[PDB]
Symmetry: C4
Amino acid sequence: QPLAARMRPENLAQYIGQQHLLAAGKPLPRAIEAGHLHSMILWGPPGTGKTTLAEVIARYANADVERISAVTSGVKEIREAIERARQNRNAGRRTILFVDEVHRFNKSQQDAFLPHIEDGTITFIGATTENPSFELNSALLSRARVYLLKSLSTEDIEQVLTQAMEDKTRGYGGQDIVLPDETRRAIAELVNGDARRALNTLEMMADMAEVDDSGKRVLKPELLTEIKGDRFYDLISALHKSVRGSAPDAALYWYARIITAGGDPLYVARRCLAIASEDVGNADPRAMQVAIAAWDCFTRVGPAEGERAIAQAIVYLACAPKSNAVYTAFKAALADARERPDYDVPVHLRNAPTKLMKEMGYGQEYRYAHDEANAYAAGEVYFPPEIAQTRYYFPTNRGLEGKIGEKLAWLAEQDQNSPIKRYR
Amino acid sequence: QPLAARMRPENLAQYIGQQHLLAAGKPLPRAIEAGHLHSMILWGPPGTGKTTLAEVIARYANADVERISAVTSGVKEIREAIERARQNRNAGRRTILFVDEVHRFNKSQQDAFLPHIEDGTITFIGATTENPSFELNSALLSRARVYLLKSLSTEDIEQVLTQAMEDKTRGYGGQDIVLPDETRRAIAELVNGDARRALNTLEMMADMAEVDDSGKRVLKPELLTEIAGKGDRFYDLISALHKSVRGSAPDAALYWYARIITAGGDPLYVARRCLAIASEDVGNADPRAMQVAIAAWDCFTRVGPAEGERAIAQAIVYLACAPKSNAVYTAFKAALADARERPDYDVPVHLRNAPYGQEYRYAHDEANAYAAGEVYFPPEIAQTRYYFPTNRGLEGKIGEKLAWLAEQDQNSPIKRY
Amino acid sequence: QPLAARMRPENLAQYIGQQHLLAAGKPLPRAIEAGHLHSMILWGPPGTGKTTLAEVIARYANADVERISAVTSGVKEIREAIERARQNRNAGRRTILFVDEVHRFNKSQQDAFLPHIEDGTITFIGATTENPSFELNSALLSRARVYLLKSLSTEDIEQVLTQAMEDKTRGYGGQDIVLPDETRRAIAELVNGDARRALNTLEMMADMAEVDDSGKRVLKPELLTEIARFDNKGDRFYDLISALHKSVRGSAPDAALYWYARIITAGGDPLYVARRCLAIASEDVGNADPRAMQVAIAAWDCFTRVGPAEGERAIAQAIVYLACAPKSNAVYTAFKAALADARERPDYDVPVHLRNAPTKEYRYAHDEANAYAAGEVYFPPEIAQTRYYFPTNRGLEGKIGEKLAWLAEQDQNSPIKRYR
Amino acid sequence: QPLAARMRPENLAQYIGQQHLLAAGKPLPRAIEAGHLHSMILWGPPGTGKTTLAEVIARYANADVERISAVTSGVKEIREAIERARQNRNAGRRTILFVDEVHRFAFLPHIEDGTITFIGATTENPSFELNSALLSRARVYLLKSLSTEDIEQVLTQAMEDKTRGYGGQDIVLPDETRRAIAELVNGDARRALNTLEMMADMAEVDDSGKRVLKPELLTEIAGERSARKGDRFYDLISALHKSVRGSAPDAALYWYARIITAGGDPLYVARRCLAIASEDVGNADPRAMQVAIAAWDCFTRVGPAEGERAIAQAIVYLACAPKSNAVYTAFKAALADARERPDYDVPVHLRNAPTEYRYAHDEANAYAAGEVYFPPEIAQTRYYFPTNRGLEGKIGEKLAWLAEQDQNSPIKRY
């Protein structure tokens, strides 16, 4: 999904180097390239390419990978990983069980892996930032070689940054984003040998940068300088409420807050569709289209321009005439269908009533509305008789509902005056 | 498709309950773990995980699964499962045949299995809610070891519910639905050790619950007690809905729609009728109707049922309220009839694909962009008319325009034919 | 793609008829069930299930199928299926070559297959209607056992039809189509044992049938007595489309519905017509009614999601809408002239004031009176007074003409003028 | 994927020409059909089927092919291909490394361990500028210019293929223009297909949807001598945007035409049409965005020459539309405030649950008159200032009427 993950190297020529370990002709790379698996502990600061290296080892070995983290894993996910390796072994395939931050596992959680190492179900790759010998079972260490990874040189971070800019398919290649050398170095200066933070930054900058008239984004050093709980739900809530309250200004403010805090702007796009049916409904049917259009736009354009499309929709909705009459009408219909008995469809409304059914229904026949005056079957009743006198929908007088209210009032008269009435 | 099917456990660690049989170290876990395949009979109450066990077994053994029910399965269905398996065996794969409610099988229906266990084409797994040693051939019971499953403890159901709530990819994880522990317990006590029912209950709660201003559904206890309270009938409802919309009755329209949704009808089936209604009963009295119906469907496609259903209800009310005209519908119908019943006349010379109207009259170069007096029919049926706009909605203006054009045609010095 | 293809049986429990050869037990169904390939000839009258039986054999054997015809296949295609087989062999895959009307190859052209039979690059299955021992070498009769199939019973046909009706994945199982038993009979008689034709009929009926208020189609006996989309498109096809577009361009809804009806009933793809509707919307209507493009997109969207007869109508609604729309080719002619200008003139450089980022000036329009930089010129100086777009007075273009004339006056009276 | 790439033969029954090497019975065909790989150097003029021969061989041997050129390939992408190939061997798959324009260069050790089977392609005698270490492992093969007959067939094959070609796309290639294409290209297959493709892309669509590829169009394509994506392209876009913002439909069409005829991608223009819809029109005309979306949807479903016209329509529409950057600047200001002001809590009455709320539908005019939706610290913040253009006239009046309700309200926050 994110840039960091997308940009993961697939072979040793893309891997930006821990050259003291991987320089061609050395022992590790000879093993990797031969596809010779051995369990390992990888020790290195954040973003040294521990995760990615493990993935590369798997591809040379023609093996599968499962990743887990000692941070967000307890007994449940350990057993899951194990069992999954087990099925993969029964299908005849090899498995690398990668474990991030292994030192966070306690002795007994560490032990759970040895029978599966011993018995060939998995090759184990553990990654940490702390010293391995300090806090891992010696039983583990005796079966897993330790390798020391160093933080990257500036040259190498810069290389990681260019690789991402140049890649036409997984990176920003052919995407009209310019990374000036001055800012490439300034990111290198800041991230202190951490490549993941470096890709994160780049992506953050790409997301935040404004588009000029040519469609180009230039990631200036000035932009760099410039930089799911109840707090989040409350922000969504204040946005919705501002829109409902016809307050476009505050609405933008809440939207901006959700955006800058890393909220998904598609999440907000979904709320705009909901709001289109619940707070506007038929006072303005186009609102649904404005909201669909903003979604469609987000989906085809860069983040900052996408977010402006959604912004446009928020202000459209904040400004629109307001009606909860479809919402209230549909809630009441639901309640009746859930609470009232299962009334049959009256004969005159059935798809193809047989002549027996017609006679069982006391001569009652479908009245085709198009063949009657005004294409209205004045006096007809569309509810089962047990609930003939039912109204759910009360148009407001806002927007288009003004005229809807008049049409309905005029229909209701045609009904009252009709000489042919259902059920009477 | 449903939440119950989507949440099938894939391996032993996802599998909740049956510890009396499955606790690590016992015989069965170990044979499963080794993926060694043996024919079996599983005995237990509905929703105890018989179905899901046969599938976990299959996953460990790297085998394909074929499911039949001695209830909902004819001879044809049964011959199909065996042949499918036989093809698998021929390509070298391993197949499990899971048979639900096996007991409801006469002995001479049971015989039609054994050749298929014996020559390895099938590994057989029977499920039954009733004791096996009664109505099953001893030939079959002599080949299929019997296993007994209990109904689930309350803590078991709670875990099944929690597992479904947390699973992000197959469940409701990262989908802004909350399950308070109280209603977690309430469902546990309601279902009485049936996990299938437990998950359906959960699923029904989610589909029913209202979405708050933050997009959250909270699955309240109130909502739960509230819940304990495809042939002719389905089609009659669809028909009631359509006729109500045609009849400009928005209230009755929402009622029939609501009856369809809550009896488990697919709201997209309704969104399809809405599209049909927009062209058959509204047409060009209001061309925007079609776009309202489209948008409702797209809206449903992007936010799911919770609020999708409401967007379709908006489309329903819109169409109910909309000016009515079947003019396009009857015109098309009559055009198709001319095409089927009158000669297949060649296209007139002036209208063929060619690279005082002696040949083609490019209409943009004439007065008012209209080639007055030009006829676009073959001469044998010149003057044919299909489209008679009503005077409702936009068609008042359209009728006015066509009447103006027909006048230009009458006054034209240049008439075709 | 079509019903007769989708409904190809794929195992012996799906294959209908030929039970004198295939009933549970006999030599043949046991060879097949085991998956043992051997060369074969199928003798039988057209429609019997030769093509499909070879497919069923292929599936039980895990093998590819390459289909050829002594009648319809030229030399290129004969060579192509041999080569594909060779390719499958080098990847360790079995391949069956099915050869229709194989009796129509001579004694010498039949010889050409034996090298590939002998070295096991092909399992050969021929299909004839004329007797095998009659026109076929013994060089070949001795490698292929002969099996004999029978014109299907009108009763086998009914089963074929109900199978397609009741198939949820491949057929009409979940499409709300009812096939009354009288229609089932009536189709059986008409086709006279050709299962493929029975299915083609069934399909014609379902694409024909009207949708009732409940969304059902009922395949009534009368629709039958009222009676090919995959044919190459010839002169007639192209004239029907030209007619349709020209009727629409000429604001004639009735003639337009007629040609459209003619195209559909001749098997034309309604999506083809939908394409033309997107073209007409920009070419013949343009900005006299920009909503026209949306009407045409919706008909397309609606055809994608719904039944044929229903989607065909949504398209009909777009057709009538376009016929009735105000007419303007002004965006069309404007764009043609703009293109002609780009191709025929020097490739003038972007003027300084319109460049993206000048080095070491631009009038941002929103900051001027009226959000108009009155007096600015957006062409290069060499072609400063160029004009392509001449709105008509129809539809929306009346107001657009008014706005444009008012802006030109604004340009006329401005104190600031580019290139002065 | 151009037609050229798309139409690559997949076996020897599809491969056109080089009959001197490939006719049934000769040593090479046999070695190809058998599936047996030997390294090789292929020499012959551009577009004679060197690249496609190599692919065809790979398919018979059930191998992958790694394509590399001595011209455009750095030391890094060379190493990459070797790594991939190794990853292939390890997965049980054979690999052909194809080397375009080998003449300008020691891959030797990867040939022995059969991790790579090597196929070089060259327009110059092999023995000339590459050593005999390589040459003693790789048979040389002589490739010839295609005959007119051969080139006509390559065109017809492309005309008749339903899947990868132009079969059933309503394109007619008259035999006269097929002949002339053969005449102009001088035995080069790739160039033939590129010319076909060019004509397809440029041919006018008639009333029936059909394209006829006539000789006139051929002569016109030949007279195109213009030179062939940097600062120039960006200023063309800039000028288009600016002309649209300035309500000049004529200049806009001219810049759009310059972008198209220079080979720019029309969907790139479509993306700028979406951007413009929100930034320069906004809610003076919210239908503008649906117009751009529709043009885009249209381009997706139809020809190039037609989709391009729908994008033209959208450009003219935007150019004539009332202008407003009110949403654009309002949002920019909201984002600034968000970023630069403190992270104020959501005011209690606007939170999702309590730990107050004035449901607006339950009040007069469905408006909570006097409610405030900002945090107290920045109450009265304004971002959105509608213009008096297009729909924004009525929107300003509505907002002015609303704010007057707020002002006269007995219930006020704070």
